[PDB]
Ligand binder design. Structure first.
Ligand SMILES: [Mg+2]
Ligand SMILES: [Mg+2]
Ligand SMILES: [Mg+2]
Ligand SMILES: [Mg+2]
Ligand SMILES: [Mg+2]
Ligand SMILES: [Mg+2]
Ligand SMILES: [Mg+2]
Ligand SMILES: [Mg+2]
Ligand SMILES: [Mg+2]
Ligand SMILES: [Mg+2]
Ligand SMILES: [Mg+2]
Lengths: 88, 70, 271, 119, 101
RNA sequence: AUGCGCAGAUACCGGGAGGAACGCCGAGGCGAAGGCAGCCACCUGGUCCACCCGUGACGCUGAGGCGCGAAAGCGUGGGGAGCAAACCGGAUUAGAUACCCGGGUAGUCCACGCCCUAAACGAUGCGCGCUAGGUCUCUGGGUCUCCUGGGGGCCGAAGCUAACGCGU
RNA sequence: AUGUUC
C-alpha cells in the first residue's frame, strides 16, 4: 500500500503551495501513483478483474482532470504531464 | 440460561488465547453459539467467531466435541 | 508444455516436440560416465527376434546409477539435468563431494543446485534414496528395487512413480505405475519422488519418419499378409479375422493371459 | 475366548437398518448384530423393534466375552436409534454413558441427488 | 514493518537440550528475516482440545515482533520446516476490542 | 432386485493417500453486474463517516469502442474423492428409451486460452432535485433517554396504477 | 411408489 509518508512526498512535490492537498496537479499526481502501483499489481495478477475496474476508474478520472487543466491553463497541463511522465 | 456476555467482565474478544473465556462461547458440542445465547451484538459475534477459529487451529478449542447422553 | 507448429507442411500440422526448458542446463553429455558404446542391433545371434526395429539415430549409452547404496551418506550436488536418448526420463548429473560423478534419473522437481543423498538416515525429500522401510508410508517414490541390492527396476519411465501403501513385516506394499499392488522388501532401495518429464506421453509424433528416427520400422498387419505368413493372412479382397485374433506365431492376442501360472513371485502381488 | 468387562457399544442406525457392534475399550469389535442377523429382511430391519432385537442379541453375545459395562456411542438419525438404546440399558449390560457421535460434514462431499433437494 | 504475533507449537516431549535447539532455530530464523522481537511468552505445555501430531499436548510459544510484512509468509514457511514445529500461526497484531467497561 | 460380501464384506479401531467443499458462527454483509463463505499472510479495488482543511463546475449521460460476464460447453495440459448427462444393469409399466435402485464416462476441480448466453430478474437504464410518517436491521458520527449520515427490509401520507400493486 | 385417455 501507499504509506502516509510516501503519499505526502508526492503531495509536497506537486502542491502549487504548501497546504495545497486538493488541486488538479496534486490530484492527478496522487492518482498516477495509485495507477502505476495498481498497474504493477495487475501485471502479476492478470486475473484480478475487480481491482481492474478501479484502475479503469482512476485512469478515466485523471483523464477528466487533465482535460480540465488542459482547458483552463494549458501550460501547467504540459508542465505537469512532463513532470509525471504521462499521456503516452 | 443467561446470556454468556452477561457472565464476564471487561474482556477482549480478539484474544484467541483466552481459552478460559472462549470455551464459554462454545456449547457442549464445540459449536459456536448463536447470539441468542452469547447475547453479543452482530459486530461482536463476528469478531468472536474469527478468534474462536484462530484458536481452534492453534489447538486450544474444539471444532467439535461430542453430545453426552442422547 | 510441448512445442507445436503451424501447418507450414502437412505432418508439421500435428508434430509436437518436447519442451526442453527443464534440460538445457547441460547439452553434451558427460565424457566419463556417458559414453559407453551402446550396441545397436534389432535381433540376437543372427535372427530378428523382435520385429520392426532398426535404423534410427546413433546413441551413446549414459551409464546411470540404479543402485544407490554404493554411496550411503555421501552428499551430492545436482550439477545438471540432461537429455538421455536411451529412456523417456531425463537424467541428473550428480557431483558427489567425493569427486565422483553419477547420473540418477532426474526426478520431477529436482533443481540444479540442490543436494541429494542416499541412505537410511537421508532426509525424505526429492531425489534422496532410502531403503523403503525408512520411508514414511504414502511417500511417492520412483526407481525402486524389487529385491534388496539387485538395482532399481520399478517406476523409471517419464512421469511414473509408486506410492508406499503400508508396511507389513520386512515388506512394504507399493502401488506400482501399473496399479498392481505388490509387496517389496523393506530393505529394497527407492528414491523419493516421481520420475517426471511427465509431459512425455503427450508428444504427438506427427509423421511416419520420426517413428523412423526412433528406431521403429513399419509394422505390417497380419491381415495384409498371405497365410504362409500369419493367421490373418489371405482371403480374397479384405477379410475379417475369421478366427479368434492371433499373433503370427499363433497364440491369441485379445485377452489370453500369459504370466506364468506357478510363478513364485505371485505370493507377493495383488492387482 | 477373550475377556473384557468394560467396552464400547456402537449403535449405527441408518434409515434402512440398525446395526450394533460392541467392542473392547480400545474399540476392537468383540461382537456385532443387526436387523438382519435377527430374522429380519428388507424394510423391517430399519424398524425400531429390530433395533431392540439387535441390541440385545448383540448384548447377549458379549456375555460370552464376560462383558459387563459399555459406553454407548450412537451414530445415526433413524428409527432404531432410540429403541436400540433402551434395549441396551435394561439388558443386563450396564450403560455407563451415552454419546451421539454422528458423523457430519463440515460441508464436504456433494451428496447423492436424493439427499440434495437442498438449496 | 508491522507488528505480528507469531504463535508456535512444539512437540511436548522435548528435553531442554532438544527444546533450546528448536527455540534457537526459531530465534536464528526470526532475526534472519529481519524480525525484531518485542514481547515473548513461553506459556509452554498445554492440553490441546484435539490431538495434534497424535499428541494430546502442545508446547506453546508466542512472539510479538515487528518485521517487514513482505517477509512474513517466507518466515512462516521456514519456521514450519522443522519436524517438532507442528503449528505456526502468524497474525497481524491488532488493537484489543472489548466487551464491558 | 441388481450390487457388495466366507478371496471375510457391513459396523468398530489404527496407519496412510488423495480430491472437493467449508459445519456451528449465519440473518445479515460486499460487489456495476455476473457473483462472492474455514483460518492465516502478502498484494489490491469499491465504499461510508468525521473535520469542513485543499481544487473551484473540473459535472450528468453516453450511439459506437474497450473490458467484465452464472452454468453448460470447446481447446491444451493437469487433477479426479464425492457427485454425475450419456451409458450399463435392477425394478416400475400396457410400453418406461423416464420417474425409484445399483454402477458409470465426460463433466463438475486447477492452469492457460476460448465461448458470451440466461427467468444475466427488482422481469424496474443512469444521474439530480422535490413530496407524511411508523417500525426492524447493518454500519459510521454525535453534551448520547434522542439526534445525524450511509445501506438493507416490512407497513403506509399525498400521488400514481388497467388492476395487482408502487410509495424518500 | 407408479397408473393413460374422452
Ligand atoms: Mg496358418
Ligand atoms: Mg483370414
Ligand atoms: Mg469380400
Ligand atoms: Mg473549504
Ligand atoms: Mg462465462
Ligand atoms: Mg464452467
Ligand atoms: Mg475441459
Ligand atoms: Mg463434445
Ligand atoms: Mg443412478
Ligand atoms: Mg430483457
Ligand atoms: Mg408499500
Amino acid at each position: 500500500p501507499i504509506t502516509k509518508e510516501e503519499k505526502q512526498k508526492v503531495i509536497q512535490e506537486f502542491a502549487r503551495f504548501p497546504g495545497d492537498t486538493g488541486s488538479t496537479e496534486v490530484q492527478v499526481a496522487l492518482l498516477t501513483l495509485r495507477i502505476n502501483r495498481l498497474s504493477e499489481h495487475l501485471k502479476v495478477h492478470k486475473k484480478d478483474h475487480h481491482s481492474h475496474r478501479g484502475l479503469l476508474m482512476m485512469v478515466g478520472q485523471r483523464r477528466r482532470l487533465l482535460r480540465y487543466l488542459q482547458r483552463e491553463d494549458p501550460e501547467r497541463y504540459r508542465a505537469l504531464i512532463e513532470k509525471l511522465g504521462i499521456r503516452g | 440460561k443467561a446470556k454468556v456476555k452477561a457472565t464476564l467482565g471487561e474482556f477482549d474478544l480478539r484474544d484467541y488465547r483466552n481459552v478460559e473465556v472462549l470455551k464459554r462461547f462454545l456449547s457442549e458440542t464445540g459449536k459456536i453459539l448463536p447470539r441468542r445465547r452469547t447475547g453479543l451484538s452482530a459486530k461482536e459475534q463476528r469478531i468472536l467467531a474469527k478468534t474462536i477459529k484462530r484458536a481452534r487451529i492453534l489447538g486450544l478449542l474444539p471444532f467439535t466435541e461430542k453430545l453426552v447422553r442422547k | 508444455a510441448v512445442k507445436k507448429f503451424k501447418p507450414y507442411t502437412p505432418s508439421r500440422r500435428f508434430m509436437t516436440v518436447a519442451d526442453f526448458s527443464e534440460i538445457t542446463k547441460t547439452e553434451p553429455e558427460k565424457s566419463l560416465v556417458k559414453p559407453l558404446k551402446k550396441t545397436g542391433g534389432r535381433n540376437n545371434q543372427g535372427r530378428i527376434t523382435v520385429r520392426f526395429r532398426g535404423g534410427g539415430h546413433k546413441r551413446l549409452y549414459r551409464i546411470i546409477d540404479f543402485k544407490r547404496w554404493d554411496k550411503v551418506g555421501i552428499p551430492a550436488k545436482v550439477a545438471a539435468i540432461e537429455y538421455d536418448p536411451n529412456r523417456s526420463a531425463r537424467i541428473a548429473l550428480l557431483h558427489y563431494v567425493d569427486g565422483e560423478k553419477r547420473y540418477i534419473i532426474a526426478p520431477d522437481g529436482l533443481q540444479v543446485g540442490q543436494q541429494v543423498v542416499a541412505g537410511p538416515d537421508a532426509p525424505i525429500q526429492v531425489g534422496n534414496a532410502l531403503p523403503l522401510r525408512f520411508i514414511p508410508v504414502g511417500t511417492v517414490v520412483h526407481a525402486v528395487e524389487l529385491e534388496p541390492k539387485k538395482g532399481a527396476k520399478l517406476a523409471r519411465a517419464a512421469g511414473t512413480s509408486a506410492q508406499i501403501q503400508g508396511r507389513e513385516g520386512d515388506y512394504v506394499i507399493l502401488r506400482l505405475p501399473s496399479g498392481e499392488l505388490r509387496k517389496v522388501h523393506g530393505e529394497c532401495y527407492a528414491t523419493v519422488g516421481a520420475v517426471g518429464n511427465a509431459d512425455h506421453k503427450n508428444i504427438v509424433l506427427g509423421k511416419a519418419g520420426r517413428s523412423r528416427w526412433l528406431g521403429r520400422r513399419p509394422h505390417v498387419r497380419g491381415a495384409a499378409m498371405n497365410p504362409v505368413d500369419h493367421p490373418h493372412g489371405g482371403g480374397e479382397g479384405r477379410a475379417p479375422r475369421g478366427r479368434p485374433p492371433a499373433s503370427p506365431w499363433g497364440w491369441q492376442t485379445k485377452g489370453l493371459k500369459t504370466r506364468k501360472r506357478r510363478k513364485p513371485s505371485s505370493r507377493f502381488i495383488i492387482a | 475366548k477373550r475377556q473384557v468387562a468394560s467396552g464400547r457399544a456402537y449403535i449405527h442406525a441408518s434409515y434402512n437398518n440398525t446395526i450394533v457392534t460392541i467392542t473392547d475399550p480400545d474399540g476392537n469389535p468383540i461382537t456385532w448384530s443387526s436387523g438382519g442377523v435377527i430374522g429380519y429382511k428388507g424394510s423391517r430391519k430399519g424398524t425400531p423393534y429390530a433395533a431392540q432385537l439387535a441390541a440385545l442379541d448383540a448384548a447377549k453375545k458379549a456375555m460370552a466375552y464376560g462383558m459387563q459395562s459399555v459406553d454407548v456411542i450412537v451414530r445415526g438419525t433413524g428409527a432404531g436409534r432410540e429403541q436400540a438404546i433402551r434395549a441396551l440399558q435394561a439388558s443386563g449390560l450396564q450403560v455407563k454413558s451415552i454419546v451421539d457421535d454422528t458423523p457430519v460434514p463440515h460441508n464436504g462431499c456433494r451428496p447423492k441427488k436424493k439427499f440434495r433437494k437442498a438449496s | 514493518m508491522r507488528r505480528y504475533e507469531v504463535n508456535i507449537v512444539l512437540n511436548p516431549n522435548l528435553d531442554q537440550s532438544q527444546l533450546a535447539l528448536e527455540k534457537e532455530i526459531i530465534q536464528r530464523a526470526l532475526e534472519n528475516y529481519g524480525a525484531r522481537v518485542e514481547k515473548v511468552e513461553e506459556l509452554g505445555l498445554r492440553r490441546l482440545a484435539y490431538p495434534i501430531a497424535k499428541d494430546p499436548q502442545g508446547y506453546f510459544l508466542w512472539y510479538q515482533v515487528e518485521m517487514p510484512e513482505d517477509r512474513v509468509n517466507d518466515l512462516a514457511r521456514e519456521l514450519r520446516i522443522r519436524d517438532n514445529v507442528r503449528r505456526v500461526m502468524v497474525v497481524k497484531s491488532q488493537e484489543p476490542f472489548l466487551a464491558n467497561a
